[PDB]
Amino acid sequence: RDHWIHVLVPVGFVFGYYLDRKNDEKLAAFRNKSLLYKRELKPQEEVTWK
Amino acid sequence: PFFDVQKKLGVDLDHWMTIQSAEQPHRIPARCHAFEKEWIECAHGIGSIRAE
Amino acid sequence: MMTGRQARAPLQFLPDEARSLPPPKLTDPRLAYIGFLGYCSGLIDNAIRRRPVLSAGLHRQFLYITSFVFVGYYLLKRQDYMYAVRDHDMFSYIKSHPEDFPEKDKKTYREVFEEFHPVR
Amino acid sequence: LLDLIWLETILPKTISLAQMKMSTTITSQKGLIKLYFLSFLITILISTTLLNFHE
Amino acid sequence: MSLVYMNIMMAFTVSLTGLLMYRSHLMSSLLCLEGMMLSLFILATLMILNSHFTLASMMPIILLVFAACEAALGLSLLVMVSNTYGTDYVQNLNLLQC
Amino acid sequence: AKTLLHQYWDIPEGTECHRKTYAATSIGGASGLVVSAYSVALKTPTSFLEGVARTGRYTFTAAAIGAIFGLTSCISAQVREKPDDPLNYLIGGCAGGLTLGARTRSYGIGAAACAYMGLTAALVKMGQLEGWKVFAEPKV
Amino acid sequence: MNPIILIIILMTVMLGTIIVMISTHWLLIWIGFEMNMLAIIPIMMKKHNPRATEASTKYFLTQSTASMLLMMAIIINLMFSGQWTVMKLFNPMASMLMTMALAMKLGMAPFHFWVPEVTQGIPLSSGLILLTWQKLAPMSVLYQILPSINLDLILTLSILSITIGGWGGLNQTQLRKIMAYSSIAHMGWMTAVLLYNPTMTLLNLIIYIIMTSTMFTLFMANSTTTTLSLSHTWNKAPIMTILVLITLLSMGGLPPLSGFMPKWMIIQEMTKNDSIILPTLMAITALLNLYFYMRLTYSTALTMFPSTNNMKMKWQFPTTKRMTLLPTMTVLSTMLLPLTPILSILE
Amino acid sequence: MLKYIIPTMMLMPLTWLSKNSMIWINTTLHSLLISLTSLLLLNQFGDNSLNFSLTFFSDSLSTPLLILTMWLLPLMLMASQHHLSKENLARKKLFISMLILLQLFLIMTFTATELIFFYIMFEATLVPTLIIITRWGNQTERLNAGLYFLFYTLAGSLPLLVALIYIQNTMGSLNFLILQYWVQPMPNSWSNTFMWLACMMAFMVKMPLYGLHLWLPKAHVEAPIAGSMVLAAILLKLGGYGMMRITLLLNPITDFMAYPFIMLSLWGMIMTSSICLRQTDLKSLIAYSSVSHMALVIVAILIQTPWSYMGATALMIAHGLTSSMLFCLANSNYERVHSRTMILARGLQTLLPLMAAWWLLASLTNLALPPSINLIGELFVVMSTFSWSNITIILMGLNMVITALYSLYMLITTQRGKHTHHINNILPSFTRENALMSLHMLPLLLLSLNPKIILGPLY
Amino acid sequence: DAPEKNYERTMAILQIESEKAELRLKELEVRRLMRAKGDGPWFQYPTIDKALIDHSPKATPDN
């Protein structure tokens, strides 16, 4: 690519965004288990958030 | 850092002169052999804090 | 502190019970940071000898990265082992001394009186 | 008076002069082995008789 | 404890205060250092002979040998000092103040 | 000299002024003798008379600091009827700082030693009250 | 010196320290110290000038005095215990004498008076050995005897070393005396945490050895023994000024650097034991060390001092000096704080 | 938070792999993209903070400071590229690396969930700032300035470290989220008194407290322009952020520990503002005005009411933009006359009229003209301090007189009157300079349309 | 993020950090007790190994 240096900060955003989402699955012990937001799962649903 | 090389390799570099109740030449006892044997066998393995 | 724990079997970098523990992944971020430190050492090695920093001696930069990752993997194994030993000793000591660790009666805040301090 | 002199005088300038003076007292040694070992003897006598670090 | 140990310890402290209060000569300091060694030899020997602690009988010899080797090293340093200033005066050894 | 500090701190504040003054004077004299010992150690005086003059000067300086400290602290504890109060040792430390300025014959050293020795003596009183430890025993 | 003789003598220095580290008998501890001193005397007289002979004589006298005090402590221990095991001592007088002897071997204040003189008198490589390798054997002996070390003595030595090493380096322009007073202050920090947690003693020892070896390797790589010759480095090797900048900021204990790692952990272990005044005053006293480190960073990296004309000749020649482990040591002395929980490998 | 930390770190290979003519353009472009990205932090809730991970969180206090921090980096690059035009290329890249590194330390200073990691990033900010001041400052005094900035901070912050570790030993945690629920009352004692001082004096130095402020009219004056921009706009606010976090743990002892410091601030803003009436150095005048404005933030945090915290965070954001713009205006005159003497170049509205309009708008925001967020923060702090004690309005209102008086005097001296005859190098305003002024002033005025995003966690 | 996601993620964070805090407090109390009493696996300072003792008949009987 002739302008390969202009993707360092954008991909570093996306990858950083990726890691944040990848961290959320490590902090999902109370997913659908809070007293405020626990509910029965809708059909064709496995988790309430990702 | 007491690197316990002597116990690691199984060599006796200096344990033999360490106590009076150790193996002596010609089985010569120290004068306090029984007292030192009693104090070592009492204090063995229980740590220095409990041995005090 | 734990020096009598590792004194019956001395000078073991990783004892045999350390193999009960899961090893660090190769994608451990600590291990990636140690590889980054190897890459920084390779760059400083090019810089102080006035080589072109990114380009010169890629074999040497790769041996820096490889040697730091190699040493750091075993250092992380020993680190995780020693914290596991710390918790194992803590839990076995609490389990063997219940008179020193009683179960405290937890009170709800309807019984708990706290003094109010007005900000005025 | 305040923010060029006295608030400058009481915290940073007096601290800096004190550390300079202590630095010059510590580093004014005459390089003599005799005086350093005489200080070591005085150290041992103060530790034994005056501080009781041997009891 | 036994009465001779008082005098051997007092000999050590006398040679210690001699070695910690220089007059002029480096040789007198080395003599006080080897007096400290001699008193350590005598005190170790009296303990080990009193206790009938057999294997430690070789200990004071080792204490002698090492320390005399140490003394040899000290004499050599003195000689090199005496090959610079003509004397072994400790007041000539003050270049390292600055 | 640990028993000097014990016979200082055993007496309650504002009760026996002469013995508190004497105990603080003895603490100051011991500190002055230590300073004099290292002073004639590391810096050789030109004579024996100059050495004993330096020793007597430093010992009397630190003993006068201790005397005026203990006197001012006990008098301020008497006239205010507040023995467990660090303002008494603040006043006493400033009196000792003015003493250290009077011995060095300078006002700036007097004001600086007033401020820093008063805050230090106030901190020592607070540490005696709340049980602050400087050489704390290993517990964990 | 013959290179074979140099290798045998350096292996004998290492052997004496290793004998101290591996032996269970007090006589072999004492033998390891004697062997180490005997072998390290030629390393100090490597260049054969009167300053090296004076430094070796002062070093001989202090270490021989400490060795005799050590043997008297061993002999008193044999009186009151009938044995020779390297463990706790069985008399407080023997404990005091051994703590004094080890403090003299370390050059901790008020036995610090040989360390700037002997460090100034000897070459940079032998002062590197003196400030790093020669601390290892007495710290290991202090490690094993800590159930009998008097608390007030070791903390008095610690704070006295930190204060005296802080004020001593403020007046210095010679680099070897700066490293010597820095050494005195860092050994005070190591002994202050010893009775509370000797793992933090080992951590402070290792980080100190890395940073001090880095600074000596930079000084050897630039052939600089003064502040003012170190100030020429920007016009000759500008990367070296960045390296001395980051290493001196690390030795000051400024986060996010690795030399912030020991003192923080030391404070972390001294407040668990309810000592609050002491690590506070220790950390504030270490600002003196940071001040003369900052003086060196101002003269070397953050400003450009005037150079000479003959420097233009040295632009035409590359550094052929073996700067052994200098990029590795520079990285470990600066970027190691994110790996602070690695310290448990020292337990 | 790692969607901001990783692009900020990717600015480092971006500046070191750029072509030599492209290192300002590329870093400016991608730092502007990071600043555009920073608005995703405005996912704030009325009850919960935005809690990303074990390490990072962002409530409505840290979020505007983060947006301002990430916004200030492109403006610092624009402000600094002209006076570093003749610089060596590697030193130019090292300068940009220090700014990038300072942004990296700041964004995880403000989002640090745990307080000792806050401490480490908070103190890590010292090293790039010290390097920028002492290496790229213009004069001799920068070296002395670098010492004062270093040693008022650490002498305050090393007792904080001990204090925080003590809380770690007492509470078991330094997580701010855990400490919201496990906070115990701090009673009156001497131990808790010095606990309070150790928790507060590092941030008192950072604000700065009056009497502790002496590092600032050397550090902000001797710095280069990007140094002064980040020092006035962001690094003063580390103290206010840290106070607003740390005073959770200091109740109820604060209710009498604040009394001296409040006095030092309430009289101090009378003093330093008055000092601005007699400053001959323009950049020193802007620095002393920063001390005077941060005195209100100190009072507002110490009286710890909802109105005072809302006013203090609004005043921190507003002062960041205004003081950064004022330093850039003073630099635009310094880059023409090469002296910071304010009486030297006069009558500049006759020569530079649009830059005189920027001087006018920055002066109006400095004197807190309504409805600017300067006035919103000013006014809300004045409301809360009137409720604290009705007499404070005297020291408040008199301050607003003097604040007007030095703001317009600065405007009258430099812009009005007759131009100096012998000065003939007054170039017309570059597009970069007017752009820098507009990128300060247009967001500052647009925040008056929607100020609720800069009113903090208890809006 | 949804408010549900941030809410329950906050609960996971709070559980992890409260458990770490309770373990640090228990670690301090365990270290205090083991240093005081010496009966745990920590603070075990060495004594003499009794396997070094010679138990053979010596030259004299009374030993």
UniProtKB/Swiss-Prot annotation, chain D:
Regions that span the bilayer: 31-51
Cellular compartments annotated: Mitochondrion inner membrane
Highest taxon listed in the record's lineage: Eukaryota
Family: Belongs to the complex I subunit 5 family.
Role: Core subunit of the mitochondrial membrane respiratory chain NADH dehydrogenase (Complex I) which catalyzes electron transfer from NADH through the respiratory chain, using ubiquinone as an electron acceptor. Essential for the catalytic activity and assembly of complex I.
Subunit record text: Core subunit of respiratory chain NADH dehydrogenase (Complex I) which is composed of 45 different subunits.
Protein name in the entry: NADH-ubiquinone oxidoreductase chain 5
Species this protein is from: Ovis aries (Sheep)
Gene that this sequence comes from: MT-ND5
From Swiss-Prot, chain E:
Disulfide feature: none
Pfam families per record: Oxidored_q2
GO CC terms: mitochondrial inner membrane; respiratory chain complex I
Keyword Transmembrane helix recorded: yes
EC number: 7.1.1.2
Residues passing through the membrane, by range: 1-21, 29-49, 61-81
Reactions listed under catalytic activity: a ubiquinone + NADH + 5 H(+)(in) = a ubiquinol + NAD(+) + 4 H(+)(out)
Secretion signal span: none
Membrane topology, as annotated: Multi-pass membrane protein
InterPro entries: NADH_UbQ_OxRdtase_chain4L/K, NUOK/Mnh_C1-like
Alphabetic keyword roster: Electron transport, Membrane, Mitochondrion, Mitochondrion inner membrane, NAD, Respiratory chain, Translocase, Transmembrane, Transmembrane helix, Transport, Ubiquinone
Subunit (UniProt): Core subunit of respiratory chain NADH dehydrogenase (Complex I) which is composed of 45 different subunits.
Entry-linked PANTHER family: NADH-UBIQUINONE OXIDOREDUCTASE CHAIN 4L, NADH-UBIQUINONE OXIDOREDUCTASE SUBUNIT ND4L
General function of this protein: Core subunit of the mitochondrial membrane respiratory chain NADH dehydrogenase (Complex I) which catalyzes electron transfer from NADH through the respiratory chain, using ubiquinone as an electron acceptor. Part of the enzyme membrane arm which is embedded in the lipid bilayer and involved in proton translocation.
Stated name of the protein: NADH-ubiquinone oxidoreductase chain 4L
From Swiss-Prot, chain G:
Gene Ontology molecular-function annotations: NADH dehydrogenase (ubiquinone) activity
Membrane topology annotation: Multi-pass membrane protein
Gene responsible for this protein: MT-ND2
Catalyzed reaction equations: a ubiquinone + NADH + 5 H(+)(in) = a ubiquinol + NAD(+) + 4 H(+)(out)
Secretion signal, residue range per the UniProt entry: none
Family: Belongs to the complex I subunit 2 family.
Protein name in the entry: NADH-ubiquinone oxidoreductase chain 2
Species: Ovis aries (Sheep)
Annotated compartments: Mitochondrion inner membrane
PANTHER family per UniProt: NADH-UBIQUINONE OXIDOREDUCTASE CHAIN 2 (PTHR46552:SF1)
Known EC number: 7.1.1.2
GO biological process, one term: reactive oxygen species metabolic process
Keyword line: Electron transport, Membrane, Mitochondrion, Mitochondrion inner membrane, NAD, Respiratory chain, Translocase, Transmembrane, Transmembrane helix, Transport, Ubiquinone
InterPro entries: Complex_I_Subunit_2 (IPR050175), NADH_DH_su2_C (IPR010933), NADH_UbQ_OxRdtase_chain2 (IPR003917), ND/Mrp_TM (IPR001750)
Primary site of residence: mitochondrion
Quaternary structure (record): Core subunit of respiratory chain NADH dehydrogenase (Complex I) which is composed of 45 different subunits. Interacts with TMEM242.
GO cellular component assignments: mitochondrial inner membrane; respiratory chain complex I
UniProtKB/Swiss-Prot annotation, chain H:
Keyword Ribosomal protein: no
Residues annotated as transmembrane: 22-42, 60-80, 98-118, 147-167, 196-216, 224-244, 256-276, 284-303, 308-330, 351-371, 391-411
One Gene Ontology biological process: mitochondrial electron transport, NADH to ubiquinone
Record membrane topology: Multi-pass membrane protein
Alphabetical UniProt keywords: Electron transport, Membrane, Mitochondrion, Mitochondrion inner membrane, NAD, Respiratory chain, Translocase, Transmembrane, Transmembrane helix, Transport, Ubiquinone
Xref: InterPro entries: NADH4_N, NADH_Q_OxRdtase_chainM/4, NADH_UbQ_OxRdtase, ND/Mrp_TM
Catalysed transformations (reactions): a ubiquinone + NADH + 5 H(+)(in) = a ubiquinol + NAD(+) + 4 H(+)(out)
Source organism superkingdom: Eukaryota
The protein, known as: NADH-ubiquinone oxidoreductase chain 4
Gene source species: Ovis aries (Sheep)
NADP keyword on record: no
Location(s) in or outside the cell: Mitochondrion inner membrane
Biological function: Core subunit of the mitochondrial membrane respiratory chain NADH dehydrogenase (Complex I) which catalyzes electron transfer from NADH through the respiratory chain, using ubiquinone as an electron acceptor. Essential for the catalytic activity and assembly of complex I.
Disulfide bond positions: none
Family under the similarity heading: Belongs to the complex I subunit 4 family.
Gene Ontology terms, MF aspect: NADH dehydrogenase (ubiquinone) activity; ubiquinone binding
Gene Ontology CC, one term: respiratory chain complex I
Enzyme Commission number: 7.1.1.2
